[PDB]
C-alpha cells in the first residue's frame, strides 16, 4: 500500500484517485508521486487552475484533482494528458515498454522482438509465407507460448534451490509477456514490411498523369527510380533477416547478453553485401554449358562464407531450400550494377595572362561514398583535428610518432626468428608493438581503430587460409606497413606531401590505409542503401539487367563469344573485340603483344570496361544548376562528349564512348 493522498485535502484519511491512476500508468511508485508533486507546482496551478484551494469545475476528478484523460488511438496506442485552462494539452510523457529499464533499451527490446519474430517464423513461415500473411497465426498466443517454453526450465531450476537471480529471470520472462501487445505491434510491423504492398489508386493516377505528359510504357517511371529491395520476395527477405552475428572472438554465433538467445544480423547490411557480390551475374552459354545463375550466386556465397562466417547458415539454407525458392532468391538478386557518371566542369583564370581555362572531371557518383573511400576522408578530417590545429603542423608529436615507429622497426629487426611459425608466437613477440601501432594510427587520425581489425590487418585478410603457419605473413605485413608509415612520416615531415593540400591517407591508400579501412570495416554493419541523389530524385545503383549490361557481362565473364564474333563476316573488323581480347595487330598483320602479355592484357582490358549512365553535367560547386540527359543543351553535351572521347589521349587516362543514339529514349 502506502498510496498517495490528496494534497487539496491534506492531513486527512483520503487518498489520491488521480494518484492511483498515475501509479497504474507509470508502473513506478516513486515517479507517480514525483509527477503528482509536479502538478502542485505554482506554474501548473496558474496554467491549469487552483484545485488545492478553489474548486474547479471543468478539469477535475471526483475528489477534486486534475483528471487524467486517456486517448486510445487507431493503433490502440494509449496516451495520457491533462487539459489546462486554455484547453491546451499537458502531455504526461508516458513511455512504452516501461518494465524494461536497460540504459541501452533499444537493443534490449530489439533482441526480444527479434527472438519472438524468429519463434513465429520458424513455427509458421518456415515452409512458405505468401498464403498465411501473418493472419492465420494469433500473435498473442505465440508470445505467451514462447514465454511458457522459455520459462519452464528456469522455473524448475528455481524450484530446485531458491535463488534471487532465477526469480529475476522469471520476472524478465513475465515482463516479456506483460508487454505482449507492444511486441505484437513491433512484429506485425516486421512481418508486414516484408510482403510488398500493391497500390492501385495512385499507381493509376501517376500512370494517367505520365501518359498525359507523354510517357509511353516503361518510360513512365525509370528503372533506377524503383528500389532493389522491392525485388526480394518476403520469403527471401525473412531468409536473409534471420542470420546470426558471429562472435569476433569465438568465431561462432554470438548470444544476446540479455536473454542468452542468439542475436541476429541486420537485414539491410546483408542485402547490401549480397547485392555487391551477387550483381552482374547472368546466364552464359560457356562451352556448350548453360549456366544456372543460382549456382554461381551460390558459389559466391560459399566464397564469401569463407571470409565473413556470418553467411555460413545462408549457404546451408540454400541447400535445404525448395527449387522455387531458389528461383525466388535468384530473381531477388539477379540484377546489374548501374553506375552514374557526373561531369563536373570547373573554370579558372590563368595566373598572369588572366585568360580562362576549364577542366572536365567525370566522377562515378554511384560508388562515390563507398565505405572504404569515405573512411579515408574520415581519416583526413580527423587528421586535421589531431595534427593540424588551425593549420599548424604539430611536427613535435609527428616526430614522436616517427621515433615510435623507428623503435618498432628496430624491435622487429632484433626479435625476428624463423622458428616462430604460429600466430600465437607472433603475438607473444609483438603484442606491445601492435598496440603501439594502434596508438600511432589513432594519433594520426584513425580514431575508430580497434585491436580486432588490427588482427585482420596483420593477417592480410587471410582467415582460414594460414592455418598453423601464419607468423611469416603477419610479420611481413607488420614490417611492411610499419616501414611504409616511416616513409609516410618522412614524406609528411619533410613536406614532400603537404597535409594542407593533398590528403595523405589517399596517397598512401594502396600501401597502408586501404587495407586498414577494409579491415576495420569488416566489423561494422552498413545499413545504408546503394543510392544516389540527382536533381531532387532518388536513384538506386542496382537495376534489373538490360541487354547491353548482359552483353558486357558476357564479354567480361565469357570472352569466347568475342572470338566467335570475330569469326563472323561483319564482326571480323571489330577493333574493340580484338582490343578487349588482346589480339591487337600491327600494320603488317603480326600481333603487337607477346603471348604472355596478351593474356594479362585481355584480363585488365576486360576488367576496366565499364558500362555507365550519364547522370548530369554541372558547374563546380553549383550542383543545383545541373542538367541530366533531358535538360542538357546540345553545346554542353557536345563539349562533354568531346572531352570524354579525347580523355584517352592523356597518359593514365581512359576514353568514354557513348552508344549510338537510342532513338527517343
Amino acid at each position: 500500500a502506502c498510496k498517495i493522498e490528496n494534497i487539496k485535502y491534506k492531513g486527512k484519511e483520503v487518498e489520491s484517485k488521480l494518484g492511483s491512476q498515475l501509479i497504474d500508468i507509470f508502473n513506478d511508485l516513486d515517479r507517480a508521486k514525483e509527477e503528482y508533486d509536479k502538478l502542485s507546482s505554482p506554474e501548473f496551478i496558474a496554467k491549469f487552475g487552483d484545485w488545492i484551494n478553489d474548486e474547479v469545475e471543468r478539469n477535475v476528478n471526483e475528489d477534486g484533482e486534475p483528471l487524467l484523460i486517456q486517448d486510445v488511438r487507431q493503433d490502440s496506442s494509449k496516451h495520457y494528458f491533462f487539459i489546462l485552462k486554455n484547453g491546451e494539452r499537458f502531455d504526461l510523457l508516458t513511455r512504452e515498454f516501461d518494465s524494461f529499464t536497460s540504459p541501452d533499451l533499444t537493443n534490449e527490446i530489439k533482441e526480444i522482438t527479434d527472438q519472438l519474430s524468429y519463434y513465429i517464423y520458424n513455427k509458421h513461415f518456415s515452409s512458405d509465407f505468401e498464403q498465411v500473411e501473418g493472419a492465420k497465426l494469433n500473435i498473442q498466443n505465440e508470445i505467451s507460448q514462447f514465454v511458457k517454453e522459455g520459462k519452464a526450465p528456469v522455473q524448475a531450476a528455481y524450484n530446485k534451490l531458491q535463488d534471487p537471480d532465477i526469480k529475476d529471470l522469471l520476472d524478465y520472462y513475465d515482463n516479456i509477456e506483460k508487454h505482449s501487445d507492444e511486441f505484437e505491434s513491433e512484429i506485425v510491423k516486421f512481418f508486414s514490411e516484408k510482403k510488398l504492398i500493391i497500390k492501385d489508386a495512385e499507381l493509376e493516377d501517376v500512370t494517367q498523369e505520365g501518359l498525359n505528359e507523354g510517357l509511353q510504357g516503361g518510360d513512365l517511371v525509370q528503372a533506377f527510380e524503383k528500389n532493389s529491395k522491392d525485388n526480394a520476395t518476403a520469403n527471401v527477405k525473412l531468409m536473409l533477416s534471420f542470420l546470426p552475428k558471429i562472435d569476433n572472438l569465438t568465431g561462432e554465433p554470438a548470444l544476446g547478453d540479455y536473454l542468452n538467445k542468439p542475436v541476429f544480423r541486420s537485414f539491410d547490411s546483408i542485402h547490401s553485401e549480397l547485392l555487391e557480390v551477387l550483381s552482374d551475374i547472368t546466364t552464359l552459354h560457356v562451352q556448350g554449358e548453360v549456366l544456372d545463375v543460382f549456382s554461381s550466386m551460390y558459389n559466391k556465397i560459399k566464397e564469401l562464407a569463407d571470409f565473413k562466417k556470418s553467411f555460413k547458415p545462408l549457404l546451408e539454407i540454400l541447400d535445404t531450400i525448395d527449387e522455387q525458392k531458389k528461383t525466388e532468391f535468384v530473381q531477388a538478386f539477379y540484377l546489374s550494377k548501374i553506375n552514374f557518371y557526373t561531369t563536373t566542369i570547373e573554370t579558372l583564370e590563368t595566373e598572369d595572362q588572366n585568360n580562362t581555362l576549364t577542366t572536365f572531371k567525370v566522377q562515378n557518383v554511384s560508388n562515390a561514398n563507398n565505405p572504404i573511400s569515405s573512411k579515408l576522408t574520415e581519416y583526413y578530417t580527423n587528421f586535421k583535428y589531431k595534427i593540424l590545429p588551425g593549420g599548424k603542423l604539430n611536427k613535435g608529436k609527428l616526430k614522436d610518432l616517427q621515433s615510435t615507429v623507428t623503435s618498432l622497426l628496430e624491435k622487429t629487426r632484433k626479435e625476428n626468428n624463423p622458428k616462430y611459425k604460429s600466430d600465437s608466437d607472433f603475438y607473444e613477440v609483438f603484442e606491445e608493438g601492435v598496440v603501439e601501432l594502434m596508438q600511432v594510427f589513432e594519433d594520426l587520425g584513425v580514431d575508430s581503430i580497434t585491436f580486432e581489425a588490427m588482427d585482420i590487418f596483420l593477417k592480410q585478410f587471410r582467415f582460414d587460409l594460414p592455418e598453423n603457419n601464419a607468423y611469416k605473413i603477419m610479420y611481413q605485413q607488420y614490417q611492411g606497413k610499419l616501414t611504409n608509415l616511416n616513409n609516410l612520416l618522412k614524406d609528411i615531415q619533410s613536406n614532400k606531401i603537404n597535409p594542407y593540400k593533398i590528403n595523405p591517407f589517399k596517397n598512401y591508400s594502396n600501401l597502408i590505409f586501404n587495407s586498414l579501412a577494409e579491415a576495420e570495416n569488416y566489423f561494422i554493419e552498413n545499413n545504408n542503401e546503394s543510392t544516389i541523389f540527382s536533381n531532387g530524385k532518388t536513384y538506386w545503383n542496382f537495376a534489373r539487367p538490360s541487354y547491353i549490361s548482359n552483353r558486357i557481362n558476357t564479354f567480361k565473364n565469357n570472352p569466347g563469344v568475342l572470338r566467335q564474333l570475330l569469326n563472323t563476316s561483319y564482326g571480323q573488323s571489330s577493333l574493340w573485340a580484338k582490343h578487349l581480347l588482346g589480339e591487337e595487330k600491327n600494320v603488317t598483320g603480326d600481333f603487337v603483344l607477346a603471348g604472355n602479355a596478351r593474356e594479362s592484357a585481355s584480363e585488365n582490358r576486360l576488367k576496366s570496361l565499364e558500362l555507365s549512365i550519364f547522370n548530369s553535367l554541372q558547374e563546380k560547386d553549383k550542383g543545383a544548376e545541373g542538367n541530366d540527359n533531358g535538360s542538357i543543351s546540345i553545346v554542353d553535351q557536345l563539349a562533354d562528349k568531346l572531352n570524354k572521347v579525347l580523355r584517352g589521349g592523356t597518359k593514365n587516362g581512359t576514353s568514354i564512348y557513348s552508344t549510338v543514339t537510342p532513338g527517343d529514349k
Binding site: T106, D205, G218, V293, N528, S633, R647
Partner: protein
C-alpha cells in the same frame, strides 16, 4: 581570337587544359591544332559507333533501312526481368513462328461510306477516310503464346506459386476461376526481346497474349494454337512484331482471309537469355477507375446545337449537354468534397475539428507506413508547426486529400490490354469457351443505323472483355446458355466507353457494346472490332486502354437474404449496430418522414445488401459471412438508374448519368464524322514537308550515320516531342473546353487571326481561309499532338522550328484562327530558327556570355541591325503574306528580318497572356497544388489576371473567368476550383491556430517581400508568382519563426556547434572502451564544420532504430543530445539538407522543452498583429544574398563613382537605358523607384537615397555562413528585432563603420539626396484586391446594365 602580340589564333570553349596540353601547351590554338582535335574526336567517335554496331547492335543491314536503324537502336537498351535458365534439358531455347501481317480492307466499308454521307463533311475528306479504312493493319505488333510458354515464363521469373499452379491446371482444363484466383490470371505478358541469333540481330516488340484453350475453343484461331502445342512453338509474332531479323514469314491465311484448317509452321529458334519481361503490369479487375482527365473535356468537341442528344426522358441540344455534363460532374465533386467535409467537421465559417484532422493524418501515415517517432508526434495532437520533421508531409497530405476528393473522380471500369480479333470473331463449330451474349458473329465497327422510330443513331462498336464483375456476381456464367444470360443482364449494362490516353481527338474515344465475356484468365484483356487500330492510331504493344463501365443494380436471391438474416440474428448484430456501420444514411436525410424511428426492416435489408452481400467491402462482414455461408448467383443485373434531380442521386447514380450523357454524345448522328475520322491529321505534316523537305530519306555521304554530330542532332530531334506532347494536349483540351466563350485581348490585334470588335478572339470553330482551304482549330491542335506523340516514328515537327521557344506563340496563333500554312511559314522563318538555335546555344555553360544580361533576342536584333544597316527602333510589326514568308524561306527576301523579329516578340509576349490563362485552367487535374506554395501562386495568379482585366490593361486577357462561371451557370472547372483552391484557402485562413505557415500573416508577408523585388527587364514582381523565391521564402520563414524557440537562442552559432562536434567525437572515442555502442552516434559522420548522417536511402526499421538510439542518448547523456539537437537546428534550420537528422530528434525533446506553448503563443501573437514579422524581410535578403532575384547583380560598368569615397563602399546607380531593368515602378508623384537590395561582385548594398534620376547604394552586412566542404548553410535570424552577423570579418566591419561615418556625414538633403524611405511603388491593384474577395474574383458575375 588575338593574343597580346597581335597574332591570330583560336580559342576553343569546353576543352579542358589536360587534353589541350596534349596538342599545344600555348594559350592560343592554331588552325592545325583545331584540325587535330576535331579530327581525333570525329574519327574516334565514328570508329566507336561502328564498334557499337559490331558488338551490340549487330549488322545494320538487317534493319529495314538506316533511318529505322536508329529507331530500333533502343532495343539494345531494353531492361526487364531476365529469367533463370540452365536447370533442365534445353532451357536456353524456345521456338517462335514469324507470321504474315494481317492487312485487310474493312469488311464493313459500304456502311462506313453510307454513314459518312450523313456527316456533313467534305467530299475529299470522306474519300480520305474511306481509303484509310481500305488498308487496316489488324495485327500490328501482336503475338500469341501457348499456356505452356506462359507457365514457363512466369515460373522462370520467380513469380510462380501453388495458386498459379492451380489456375494453370484450370486453364488447361477450361475450368472457370474462382474469386480468389482472379488476380492470378494469364493476362498478356508485356515482354520484349533483343538478341543475336546466329549473328543476325532479332528484335521482338510485341504483346504476348496467352492462347487459353477456353479462348481458342470454338474459333478459327484454335488451329493455330493447336500447331504450336504440337510443334513445341512457344511464341508466335506477326512480322510487324519482329522489327529486325525476322525470317521469311509463314502464311496462315486462305485466299478469302480465313485461316488455315491445319497449319504447320516454320520455326525460328531463339535464346531465352535475351528475353526479358519488360513491364510487370498487375491484374486489376473491374474496379473504381479514375476517369480520364482528357476525355471528360474532349467530349465537348463534337457538341453542336444543330443536333438533339436524347437520353431516357431527357433531350438536350449542343449547349444544354455542355451544362448538363458540367452540372453532373460538378455534382460528383460536390458530393466527394462534402464527405471530406464530414471527415473534418467543417463548420459553416470554415473551422474544422482538430481531433478529426489528426485522426485522418494518423490513418494515412499508418496505411502508408511511418517511422514511430513521426506517428507518435502526430498522435500527441501537437500543432503541425511543432513537428519539424514532418510539417511538409502533413501539409502535402491535407492538400492531397482535398484534391483527390474534389478532382480525382472515379467511375466503374478498368485498364485493359488490347488483343487483336484475328481468329476470334470468326467462329467454327460450337464455342464452349467465349461466353457469347448475342448470336455469334463478326466484331463490327461503329456505323450509323436507324432505330424503330427512324432516327439515325450510331450502332456502337463490338467488344470482347473479361467482365470479372459479372463473373463474381454470376458464377457459372460460362455454363449458362446464351438466352438465359442475354435476358439476365440488362442490355444497357453490356455497354462501355473506351478511351485512350493521350486523347488526341474524338477518335480515341469509342462507344462499345459487350457481345462476349472473355475467359476470366485473360486478365485485363479487351478484344475490339477489326478497324480500331486504324481509327485510334494504336498498336498492340501500346499501354493499357481505359474504359468506363456502368454500375450494376443486382437482385440477390431470396436464399441469400434468408442466410444473411440467419447469420445476422445468430451472430447477434444489434439493430443499431447495422445503422451504426452504414454511415451512408441514404434514408435518414429525406426518407424518414414515413420511416421515422420505427422502421428497422429497411435498415436491415440495406445493411445486408451493402455490407454482407456486397462482394467488395472493407467491413469484413462479407468475408466472415462467406466463410461458411455461400452466396448465390444474382437473379438480374441491371443498369443502375439516375434521377433528373442530381441531389437525389448518390455517387454511383451520378457516375451512370455521366456515362449515359457521354453515350448520347458518342452515339449521335452528327458526331459520327468526328468518331470515324482516323487519328492522322496531315495538313501541318504535309505543309512542313513540302516547304522544308522530307527528311525520312537520308543518305550516309561522308560516313554520316556514324558521325557524332549527326547522332547528337538526331537525339535532340527525337527528344523534342516529349516536351511538346503535354503542352499540345493541354492546349487542345482547353480549346475544346472554351469554344463557347470568346476570350480575347483587350485592345490588341495580332494582325492575323479572327477578330471581334477590334480584338483578337480565341477558340472559334474554324481558322481563317487562305488559298481556298480552312481547317478546324481542333484538327490543327490534334495534328500537332499527333506529331508530338509519333515524333519517334517520324520527326517532322522540329523541322518547322516548332520547339519549346516557339510552342506558345504557335498555339496562340492556332487558337486565334490563323491558317496552319501561315503558322508553318512564320514559325519556320529562317531568322526565327536562328533565334531559337541561339537561345539554346546562349544559355549553355560552355559558351561564356560576352554581355550577361543581353538577351539572345537582343544579340540577334543587333546582328541583323548591323547586317541590314537598319534600326530595330524604326522597325514595325507587320502581318505579312504567305508569298513573302514562303519566298523568304526558298529565296532570301531583304528587309523583313527585323520586322519578323518584332512581330515574333510581340506574339511571344501575348502568348505569355494566353499561357497564363491556360495555367489557371488546370484545376481539374492539379487541383489547389501539392504544396502550400502552389496554392499561394495559384491564388495570386487568379488575382493578377483579375486586376489586369478590371484595370482594362492594354494586352490583357478578357472573358477568362467565364471558364469558371458563364451564362449565370456554374461550370465543371468552376466547381472544381471552388472546392479545391477556395476550399483549402478557407481551411488555411479560418484555422490559424493550426496552419501557421498557411495563415494570412505569412501569405501577406510573402506578398510584400515579393512586391519589393524587381524582375529583370524592369518589372515589379508584385504578388508572389515566382516559384524559386517562394521556396526560399518558406524555407527561411520556418527558420525565422523557430529562431525564437528558447533552446535555439544561442549566440555565436558556429562556435556552439563546434563545441558540440568536439563533445560528439569524444563520446565516440570513449565508447570504444565500453564495447557496447550507441546506434545514433555510430551513424554520425563529422565534417570540418558540421555533423550528421549520409543522405542515402534508409528503410523504416533503420530510421526507427536511429530514433530509438537517439532517445536512449537523451536519457544517458542528456546534455550531449540537447547540444546535438540545437546544432541540428543551427546548422540547417530544419531544411532538407544532405546531412539532416531532424527526423530522428525525439519528439520527447520538443515536448519537454515546451514546443506546444511556444507554437500556440506564436499563433495567438500573430493572430492580432503582424508587427513581429516586420524585421524578417531584410534578414531574409541578407542571408540568401546570393540569389540574383533577391539581390540583383548590377554590372560594375554602369556604376558611377561619387566624390569623397571609393566606388566599392558607396556608389550611385543612375536611371539609364542600361538600368531600366531595375526600376520597380512609379510613385504617386510619378517618381521612379529602384530596388532596395543590390549586390555588385561579391558585396551587398542597400539603397539609401535618390539624387535626381539616380539612387545611391551603401555597403551592408551579409548574414549566414556557407561552407560547401561540410554541407553547411547557417542562417542567422532573430524574431521581432534586428540582428548583427557573427561572421563578418574585422577589416570588413571597420570598412562598414567608416562607410557609415562618411554617409552620415554628407548624404543629407543639403547635398541633394532625398531619403529612400519616401519613394514607394504606387500599386493600383491593392485597392481592387481589398475591395474584392477571392470568391467574387473567381466567379465574377457582378451585375451590370
Amino acid at each position: 581570337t588575338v593574343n597580346k602580340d597581335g597574332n591570330k589564333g583560336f580559342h576553343f570553349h569546353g576543352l579542358d587544359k589536360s587534353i589541350m596540353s596534349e596538342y599545344t601547351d600555348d594559350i592560343q590554338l592554331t588552325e592545325f591544332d583545331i584540325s587535330h582535335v576535331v579530327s581525333d574526336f570525329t574519327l574516334n567517335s565514328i570508329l566507336a559507333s561502328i564498334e557499337y554496331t559490331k558488338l551490340f547492335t549487330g549488322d545494320p543491314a538487317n534493319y529495314k533501312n538506316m533511318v529505322d536503324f536508329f529507331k530500333r537502336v533502343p532495343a539494345t537498351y531494353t531492361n526487364g526481368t531476365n529469367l533463370r535458365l540452365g536447370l533442365e534439358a534445353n532451357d536456353h531455347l524456345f521456338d517462335v513462328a514469324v507470321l504474315e501481317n494481317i492487312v485487310k480492307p474493312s469488311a464493313y466499308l459500304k456502311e462506313i461510306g453510307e454513314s459518312l454521307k450523313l456527316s456533313d463533311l467534305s467530299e475529299a475528306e470522306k474519300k480520305y477516310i474511306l481509303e484509310a479504312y481500305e488498308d487496316v493493319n489488324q495485327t500490328d505488333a501482336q503475338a500469341w503464346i501457348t499456356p505452356k510458354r506462359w507457365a514457363f515464363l512466369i515460373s522462370r521469373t520467380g513469380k510462380w506459386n501453388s495458386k498459379y499452379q492451380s489456375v494453370y491446371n484450370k486453364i488447361l482444363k477450361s475450368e472457370s476461376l474462382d474469386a480468389s484466383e482472379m488476380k492470378l490470371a494469364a493476362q498478356p505478358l508485356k515482354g520484349v526481346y533483343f538478341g543475336l541469333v546466329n549473328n543476325t540481330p532479332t528484335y521482338l516488340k510485341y504483346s504476348q497474349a496467352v492462347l487459353l484453350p477456353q479462348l481458342v475453343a470454338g474459333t478459327q484461331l484454335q488451329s493455330l494454337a493447336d500447331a504450336m502445342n504440337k510443334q513445341d512453338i512457344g511464341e508466335s509474332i506477326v512480322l510487324d512484331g519482329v522489327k529486325v531479323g525476322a525470317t521469311t514469314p509463314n502464311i496462315v491465311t486462305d485466299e478469302n482471309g480465313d485461316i488455315l484448317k491445319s497449319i504447320s509452321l516454320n520455326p525460328l529458334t531463339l535464346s531465352n537469355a535475351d528475353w526479358k519481361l519488360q513491364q510487370d503490369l498487375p491484374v486489376k479487375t473491374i474496379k473504381p477507375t479514375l476517369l480520364g482527365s482528357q476525355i471528360q473535356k474532349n467530349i465537348y468537341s463534337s457538341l453542336t446545337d444543330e443536333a438533339t442528344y436524347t437520353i431516357e426522358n431527357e433531350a438536350f441540344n449542343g449547349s444544354g449537354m455542355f451544362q448538363a455534363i458540367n452540372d453532373t460532374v460538378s455534382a460528383m465533386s460536390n458530393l466527394s468534397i462534402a464527405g471530406l467535409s464530414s471527415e473534418l467537421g467543417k463548420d459553416s465559417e470554415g473551422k474544422i475539428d482538430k481531433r478529426k484532422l489528426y485522426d485522418m493524418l494518423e490513418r494515412e501515415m499508418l496505411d502508408k507506413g511511418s517511422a514511430i517517432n513521426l506517428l507518435k508526434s502526430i498522435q500527441k495532437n501537437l500543432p503541425i508547426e511543432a513537428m519539424p520533421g514532418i510539417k511538409d508531409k502533413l501539409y502535402n497530405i491535407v492538400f492531397s486529400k482535398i484534391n483527390s476528393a474534389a478532382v480525382k473522380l472515379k467511375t466503374n471500369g478498368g485498364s485493359f490490354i488490347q488483343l487483336s480479333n484475328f481468329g476470334l470473331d470468326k467462329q467454327t463449330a460450337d464455342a464452349k469457351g467465349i461466353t457469347w451474349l448475342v448470336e455469334p458473329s463478326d466484331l463490327k465497327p461503329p456505323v450509323i443505323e436507324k432505330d424503330a422510330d427512324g432516327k439515325n443513331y450510331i450502332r456502337p462498336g463490338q467488344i470482347f472483355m473479361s467482365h470479372v464483375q459479372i463473373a463474381k456476381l454470376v458464377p457459372d456464367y460460362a455454363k449458362m446458355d446464351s438466352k438465359t444470360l442475354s435476358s439476365m443482364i440488362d442490355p444497357k449494362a453490356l455497354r462501355a466507353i473506351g478511351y485512350r490516353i493521350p486523347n488526341q481527338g474524338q477518335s480515341s474515344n469509342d462507344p462499345l457494346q459487350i457481345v462476349g465475356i472473355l475467359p476470366e484468365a485473360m486478365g485485363d484483356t479487351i478484344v475490339a472490332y477489326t478497324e480500331i487500330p486504324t481509327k485510334t492510331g494504336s498498336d498492340f504493344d501500346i499501354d493499357k486502354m481505359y474504359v468506363m463501365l456502368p454500375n450494376f443494380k443486382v437482385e440477390h436471391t431470396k436464399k441469400s437474404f434468408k442466410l444473411a438474416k440467419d447469420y445476422i440474428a445468430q451472430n447477434e448484430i444489434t439493430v443499431e449496430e447495422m445503422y451504426d456501420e452504414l454511415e451512408d444514411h441514404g434514408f435518414n436525410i429525406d426518407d424518414i418522414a414515413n420511416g421515422e424511428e420505427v422502421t428497422e426492416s429497411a435498415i436491415t435489408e440495406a445493411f445486408i445488401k451493402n455490407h454482407i452481400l456486397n462482394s467488395n467491402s472493407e467491413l469484413e462482414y462479407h468475408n466472415d459471412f462467406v466463410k461458411q455461408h455461400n452466396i448465390d448467383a444474382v437473379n438480374k443485373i441491371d443498369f443502375l438508374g439516375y434521377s433528373e434531380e442530381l441531389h437525389k442521386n448518390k455517387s454511383e447514380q451520378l457516375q451512370n448519368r455521366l456515362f449515359d450523357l457521354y453515350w448520347a454524345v458518342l452515339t449521335n448522328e452528327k458526331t459520327y464524322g468526328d468518331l470515324i475520322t482516323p487519328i492522322d491529321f496531315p495538313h501541318v505534316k504535309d505543309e512542313i514537308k513540302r516547304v522544308f523537305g522530307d527528311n525520312s530519306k537520308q543518305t550516309g555521304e561522308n560516313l554520316k550515320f556514324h558521325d557524332p554530330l549527326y547522332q547528337l542532332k538526331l537525339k535532340f530531334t527525337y527528344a523534342g516531342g516529349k516536351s511538346g506532347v503535354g503542352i499540345t494536349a493541354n492546349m487542345l483540351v482547353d480549346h475544346n473546353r472554351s469554344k463557347g466563350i470568346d476570350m480575347q485581348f483587350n485592345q490588341y490585334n495580332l494582325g492575323v487571326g479572327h477578330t471581334q470588335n477590334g480584338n483578337t478572339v480565341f477558340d472559334k470553330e474554324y481558322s481563317e481561309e487562305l488559298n481556298g482551304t480552312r481547317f478546324k482549330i481542333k484538327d490543327t491542335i490534334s495534328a500537332f499532338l499527333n506529331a508530338f506523340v509519333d515524333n519517334a516514328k517520324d520527326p517532322y515537327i522540329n523541322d518547322g522550328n516548332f520547339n519549346t521557344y516557339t510552342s506558345s506563340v504557335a498555339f496562340m496563333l492556332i487558337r486565334a484562327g490563323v491558317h496552319p500554312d501561315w503558322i508553318i511559314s512564320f514559325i519556320g522563318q529562317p531568322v526565327l530558327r536562328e533565334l531559337a538555335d541561339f537561345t539554346q546555344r546562349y544559355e549553355s555553360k560552355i559558351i561564356p556570355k560576352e554581355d550577361v544580361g543581353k538577351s539572345s533576342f537582343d544579340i540577334i536584333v543587333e546582328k541583323y541591325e548591323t547586317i541590314n544597316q537598319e534600326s530595330y527602333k524604326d522597325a514595325e510589326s507587320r502581318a505579312f503574306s504567305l508569298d513573302t514568308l514562303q519566298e523568304s524561306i526558298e529565296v532570301g527576301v531583304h528587309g523583313i528580318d527585323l520586322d519578323v523579329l518584332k512581330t515574333f516578340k510581340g506574339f511571344q509576349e501575348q502568348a505569355k497572356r494566353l499561357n497564363e490563362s491556360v495555367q489557371l485552367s488546370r484545376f481539374d487535374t492539379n487541383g489547389s497544388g501539392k504544396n502550400i506554395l502552389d496554392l499561394i501562386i495559384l491564388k495570386n495568379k487568379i488575382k493578377n489576371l483579375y486586376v489586369s482585366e478590371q484595370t482594362q490593361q492594354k494586352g490583357s486577357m478578357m472573358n477568362h473567368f467565364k471558364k469558371y462561371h458563364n451564362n449565370g451557370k456554374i461550370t465543371s472547372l468552376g466547381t472544381q476550383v471552388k472546392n479545391t483552391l477556395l476550399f483549402t484557402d478557407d481551411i488555411l485562413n479560418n484555422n490559424p491556430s493550426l496552419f501557421l505557415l498557411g495563415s494570412k500573416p505569412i501569405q501577406d508577408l510573402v506578398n510584400s517581400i515579393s512586391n519589393n523585388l524587381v524582375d529583370s527587364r524592369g518589372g515589379s514582381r508584385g504578388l508572389l508568382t515566382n516559384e524559386d523565391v517562394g521556396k526560399l521564402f518558406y524555407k527561411e520563414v520556418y527558420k525565422y519563426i523557430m529562431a525564437d524557440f528558447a533552446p535555439f537562442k544561442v549566440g555565436d552559432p558556429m562556435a556552439y556547434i563546434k563545441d558540440t562536434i568536439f563533445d560528439l567525437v569524444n563520446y565516440k572515442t570513449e565508447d570504444k572502451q565500453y564495447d557496447s555502442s550507441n546506434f545514433f552516434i555510430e551513424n554520425m559522420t563529422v565534417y570540418e564544420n558540421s555533423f550528421g548522417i549520409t543522405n542515402k536511402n534508409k528503410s523504416v526499421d533503420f530510421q526507427d532504430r536511429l530514433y530509438r538510439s537517439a532517445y536512449d542518448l537523451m536519457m544517458e547523456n542528456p546534455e550531449l543530445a540537447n547540444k546535438m539537437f540545437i546544432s541540428s537546428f543551427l546548422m540547417n534550420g530544419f531544411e532538407n539538407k544532405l546531412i539532416d537528422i531532424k527526423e530522428y530528434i525525439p519528439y520527447q525533446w520538443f515536448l519537454e522543452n515546451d514546443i506546444r506553448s511556444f507554437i500556440e503563443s506564436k499563433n495567438t501573437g500573430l493572430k492580432d498583429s503582424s508587427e513581429s514579422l516586420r524585421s524578417f524581410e531584410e534578414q531574409f535578403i541578407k542571408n540568401n544574398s546570393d540569389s540574383n532575384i533577391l539581390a540583383p547583380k548590377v554590372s560594375q560598368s554602369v556604376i558611377k563613382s561619387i566624390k569623397g569615397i571609393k566606388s566599392k563602399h558607396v556608389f550611385e546607380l543612375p536611371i539609364n537605358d542600361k538600368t531600366k531593368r531595375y526600376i520597380l515602378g512609379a510613385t504617386e508623384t510619378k517618381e521612379e523607384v529602384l530596388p532596395n537590395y543590390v549586390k555588385v561582385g561579391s558585396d551587398l548594398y542597400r539603397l539609401k537615397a535618390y539624387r535626381e534620376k539616380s539612387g545611391v547604394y551603401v555597403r551592408t552586412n551579409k548574414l549566414g555562413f556557407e561552407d560547401p566542404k561540410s554541407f553547411l548553410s547557417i542562417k542567422e535570424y532573430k524574431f521581432g528585432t534586428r540582428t548583427g552577423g557573427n561572421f563578418t570579418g574585422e577589416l570588413t566591419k571597420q570598412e562598414l563603420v567608416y562607410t557609415n561615418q562618411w554617409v552620415n556625414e554628407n548624404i543629407t538633403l543639403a547635398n541633394g539626396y532625398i531619403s529612400a524611405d519616401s519613394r514607394t511603388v504606387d500599386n493600383p491593384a491593392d485597392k481592387i484586391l481589398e475591395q474584392n474577395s477571392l470568391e467574387n474574383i473567381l466567379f465574377s458575375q457582378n451585375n451590370v446594365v
